[PDB]
């Protein structure tokens, strides 16, 4: 009973991780693409603050 309970959690706790890995890199990707299209705006904001 132990044996098939330990093998129950293992065969889910690799699948769950594997799937979380797919989501981690898409949710990294989901902030990069927003940022590079709201880019000229950061640069411009910073500039007008380093000429003082």
């Amino acid at each position: 009973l132990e044996a098939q309970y330990r093998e129950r959690e293992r065969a889910e706790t690799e699948a769950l991780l594997a799937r979380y890995r797919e989501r981690a890199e898409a949710e990294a990707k989901a902030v990069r693409e927003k940022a590079m299209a709201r880019l000229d705006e950061a640069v411009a904001l910073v500039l007008k603050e380093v000429l003082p």
Partner: protein
């Protein structure tokens, strides 16, 4: 005459006894089935907890 039959009046008292102890050899087995069973109800719940716990940890990690 009772001679051989004389012995069947004992074999009937000493058959009453032997059935009273096969009414204890049943009771003993009842309690022992209800024991063996309960050791696996505890086995079931504790493992269930350790599987609830193992997936919850692995979600917070994920």
């Amino acid at each position: 005459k009772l001679e051989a039959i004389l012995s069947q009046e004992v074999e009937a008292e000493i058959q009453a006894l032997l059935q009273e102890a096969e009414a204890k050899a049943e009771a003993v087995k009842r309690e022992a089935e209800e024991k063996a069973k309960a050791l696996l109800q505890a086995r079931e719940r504790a493992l269930e907890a350790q599987y609830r716990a193992a997936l919850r940890r692995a979600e917070s990690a994920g």
